[PDB]
Amino acid sequence: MALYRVVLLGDPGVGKTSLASLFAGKHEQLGEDVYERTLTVDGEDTTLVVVDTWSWSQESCLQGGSAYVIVYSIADRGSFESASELRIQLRRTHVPIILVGNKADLARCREVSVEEGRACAVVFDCKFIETSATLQHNVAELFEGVVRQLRLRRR
Ligand SMILES: Nc1nc2c(ncn2[C@@H]2O[C@H](COP(=O)(O)OP(=O)(O)O)[C@@H](O)[C@H]2O)c(=O)[nH]1
Ligand SMILES: [Cl-]
Ligand SMILES: [Mg+2]
Incomplete structure (x- = not known):
């Protein structure tokens, strides 16, 4: 068991809140875009707190994360471009980074190739998945993958 803060980054409209809601699953909480769940992976439980808020919290945001998930839409070149900009922001501030190509079902509107997503992970030195x-x-697989990468830090 452990607890980790996972921060969702990316342009508006790429599906960050949607991915977080699926992670949360099916009022007293102070603050609104924070999702908590304990996942069982390789026979072991781990809690992730997934933050979807992308000001003191705005400044601290790129320094507090245990892991970062940078999401773009495969149907929107602009979102992919600004993904690259986000890695550099993270640099300017030893942490797993997942590049996520969301909206894979829009396979006919595809503006960003699989190969382009892969190259970008290579250039960012990070992990890659399409959801x-x-x-x-691949949503469960995204968050289960984050847990595994975090566990490789500790060991
Ligand atoms: N087709 C498709 N639409 C998606 C996907 N993920 C999100 N959307 C849609 O894209 C819009 C933006 O979603 P949202 O989660 O609010 O994006 P956010 O601004 O990044 O949080 C919504 O209308 C979603 O229904 C996806 O994987 N495929
Ligand atoms: Cl889109
Ligand atoms: Mg949102």
Whole structure:
């Protein structure tokens, strides 16, 4: 068991809140865009607190995270470009970074190739996956992957 803060970054409209809601699953909470769940992975439980807020919290945001998930939409070149900008922001401030290509189901609107997503992880030195929140594809696998990468830090 452990607890980690996972921060969701990316342009508006790429599906950050959708991915977080699927992670949260099916009022007294101070603050609103923070999602908590304990996941069982490789027979072991781990809690992630997934932050979806992308000011003291705005300044601290890129320094507090145990892991960062930078999301873009495969149907929007602009969002992919600004993904690259976000890694550099993170640099300017030893932490897992996942580059996520969301909206994989829009396979006919594809503006960003799989190869382009892969190259970008290579250039960022980080992990890569494509998901769809509307088909519920690779979402569980995204967050389970984050847990595994975090556990490689500790060991
Ligand atoms: N087709 C498709 N639409 C998605 C996907 N993820 C999110 N959306 C849609 O894109 C819009 C923006 O989603 P939202 O989660 O608010 O994006 P956010 O600004 O990054 O939080 C919503 O209308 C979603 O239904 C996806 O994987 N596939
Ligand atoms: Cl889009
Ligand atoms: Mg949102």
